[PDB]
Amino acid sequence: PYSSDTTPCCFAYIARPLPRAHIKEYFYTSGKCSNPAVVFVTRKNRQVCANPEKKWVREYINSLEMS
Amino acid sequence: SSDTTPCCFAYIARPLPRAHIKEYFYTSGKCSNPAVVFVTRKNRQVCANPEKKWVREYINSLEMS
């Protein structure tokens, strides 16, 4: 069983690092999705898909978990 | 694009009340499961199976405007 409401998934990854200071939150997309992914929420409240295997992505996450 | 896309992994079991649905759309073909999304006046996005009869009827209804 699972939510019958839509769930966000990512089908593309932002090619380069987003400005760290423009990011306030992050979350991993559901494991139900075909692609693993990190979604960064910017201070303008935009949601950007990123590759969790990328070094900058992991560092941003580590940083965010400290703030 | 690197923006998120809504996908469906389960279909609502029973027919939603027709009265509170304002529109509908089909989830992206990129999603693994085919699906119709009914958007309620409270903006909930409910997943439904396109093959279901009530689903097709609701769609036809929304198409007749």
Ligand SMILES: O=C(O)C1=C[C@H](O)[C@@H](OS(=O)(=O)O)[C@H](O[C@H]2[C@H](O)[C@@H](NS(=O)(=O)O)[C@@H](O)O[C@@H]2CO)O1
């Ligand atoms: O973040 C949440 O509070 C959250 C609530 C809902 O239970 C789920 O939202 S969803 O139906 O839109 O996906 C989701 O819960 C879980 C996911 O189910 C997990 N994915 S799974 O494939 O292992 O099931 C994963 O993404 O973690 C979240 C939060 O614990 O999100």
